[PDB]
């Protein structure tokens, strides 16, 4: 049950867009699926507590004497007051269309979260111990690494996507390989985050060699040994790779430490934190 993927990672000053803990992510990689994620927000709503025939009804409301509803459209709820699976829901669309007579139609209902938008994965109708009617709506959303999304290697350094370049523009290696992910070298000396480098070194050998790379602490494994193995695989042993600027094709004057590295995609995604409450 792994949590992350092996990014082809370049430590490079590239376009200037990966400074101060951003990352230039490869947009093409994104397209082909790299770091996509499902996201299941499942909402829950109940029926009435103790009210002497003051029930709450999961059904479609269309305004009568209180009109107290929300701006989201009910055009999506079925006549049982529940979106059925499959139905794409966005904006502030109502999901659990609920109603309550209070002492005829005071709408209390769960609309989809403002910033969110998905597709319904499963609506589930249950019974409690007090026999209360339960509804659980799972709303599925596919989340595509954008600008702002946060990514951390396995060594306590996160960083966001600054920009995504397409494969064309990325700086490429003689092999036609191009990085999924360009990080900045200035992130390195000051963290002392050598593991990241040695994992990266290893991760390369590993990929090349099919052999799972033992990066366990207190093994007798060595940058020098991992170096030797990479070297045997016909790459320069310290990880570097001559690379060609994508715009021009010209070689990069400097060589770019290149390698797989396990990156984790962390939650709290851009779209959840764009909250712009101008009033």
């Amino acid at each position: 049950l792994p949590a992350g993927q092996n990014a082809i990672v370049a430590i490079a000053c590239y376009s200037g867009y990966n400074q101060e803990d951003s990352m230039i992510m490869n947009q093409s990689s994104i397209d082909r699926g790299l770091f996509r994620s499902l996201f299941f927000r499942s909402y829950m709503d109940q029926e009435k507590k103790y009210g002497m025939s003051i029930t709450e009804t999961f059904e479609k409301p269309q305004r009568t004497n209180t009109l107290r509803m929300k701006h989201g459209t009910y055009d999506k709820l079925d006549d049982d007051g529940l979106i059925a699976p499959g139905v794409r829901v966005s904006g502030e669309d109502v999901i659990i269309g609920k109603t309550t007579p209070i002492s005829s139609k005071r709408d209390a209902s769960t609309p989809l979260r403002s910033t969110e938008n998905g597709i319904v994965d499963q609506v589930l109708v249950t019974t409690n111990q007090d026999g209360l009617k339960f509804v659980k709506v799972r709303v599925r959303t596919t989340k595509i690494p954008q600008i702002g999304d946060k990514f951390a290697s396995r060594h306590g350094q996160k960083g966001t996507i600054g920009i995504t370049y397409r494969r064309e523009d990325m700086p490429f290696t003689a092999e036609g390989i191009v990085p999924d992910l360009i990080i900045n070298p200035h992130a390195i000396p000051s963290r002392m985050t050598v593991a990241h480098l040695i994992e990266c070194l290893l991760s390369k050998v590993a990929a090349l060699s099919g052999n799972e790379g033992d990066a366990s602490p207190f093994t007798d494994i060595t940058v020098e040994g991992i170096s030797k193995l990479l070297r045997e695989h016909g790459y320069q042993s310290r990880g570097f790779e001559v690379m060609y600027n994508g715009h021009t094709g010209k070689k990069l004057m400097a060589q770019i430490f290149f390698g797989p590295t396990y990156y984790q995609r962390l939650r709290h995604m851009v779209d959840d934190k764009i909250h712009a409450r101008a009033r």
Binding site: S15, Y17, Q146, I163, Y165, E168, D169, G246, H247, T248
Partner: protein, 114 residues
């Protein structure tokens, strides 16, 4: 959501031309052209062709922001040499060079077995 539709990269939306031609003010016999919905693909090409041409004094191009698909191109040509004609000329110069390659290739491709 903010993400601009990816077509906007190679496809001109309304009102935009392919080329805007501006008469560089700073220098004589120079022009700045804005290609909309192109990129380095073309830029670096046209420039390094424009640059071969000897009656061209100055050729440079830049894409000022990775977000947008467009780039500017500045050509300073000799007095009495029109940059548009230098472009035209460096443009042709390419079309002809690619014809060659297209040929040479399809040619050397056929001789191959597999």
């Amino acid at each position: 959501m903010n993400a601009p539709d990816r077509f906007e990269l190679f496809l001109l939306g309304e009102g935009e031309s392919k080329l805007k031609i501006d008469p560089d003010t700073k220098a004589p016999n120079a022009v700045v052209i804005t290609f909309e919905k192109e990129d380095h693909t073309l830029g670096n090409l046209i420039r390094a062709e424009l640059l071969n041409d000897r009656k061209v004094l100055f050729a440079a191009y830049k894409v000022e922001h990775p977000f947008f698909a467009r780039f500017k191109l500045r050509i300073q040509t000799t007095e009495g040499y029109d940059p548009k004609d230098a472009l035209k000329n460096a443009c042709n110069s390419i079309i002809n060079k690619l014809g060659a390659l297209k040929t040479n290739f399809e040619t050397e491709w056929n001789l191959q077995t597999l």
